[PDB]
Design a protein around this ligand. Sequence first.
Ligand SMILES: C[N+](C)(C)CCOP(=O)([O-])OCCCc1ccccc1
Length: 143
Amino acid sequence: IAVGKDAPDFTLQSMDGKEVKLSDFKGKKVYLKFWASWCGPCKKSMPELMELAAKPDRDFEILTVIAPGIQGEKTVEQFPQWFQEQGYKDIPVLYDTKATTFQAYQIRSIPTEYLIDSQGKIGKIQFGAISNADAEAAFKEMN
Ligand SMILES: C[N+](C)(C)CCOP(=O)([O-])OCCCc1ccccc1
């Protein structure tokens, strides 16, 4: 994994039971956030991400990834209940049930965001939360 190189492919079930592939988003920039329900700064960054999702006419898609049941994350049954109770919605959550997407993207800390360009290359990486302003600006400087 490296800035400027292809973002690793993945095929994951969403919280809502749909299969989602990075390749589904060819030609769209992607905001890809790895997080966990047990992580304070991850929770704290979610309402701001809902703000971003609510903005019309974005040339990027938002996708987030958790590893359900892994290293303390909530079970697949418990997670959606918790998510809804926080008031969270309109944010895709993909289930990395094998931890292989976290592994593929070499996650060391959370939250981590990969901002992937329209050509499927990693454009930016941010350790910790990124402001919506900074994310929007970043996507403007990417292909
Ligand atoms: C606070 N509790 C102990 C759950 C969270 C920290 O757990 P920990 O054992 O101290 O750190 C490893 C988690 C890193 C990770 C993330 C996602 C998938 C695979 C590995």
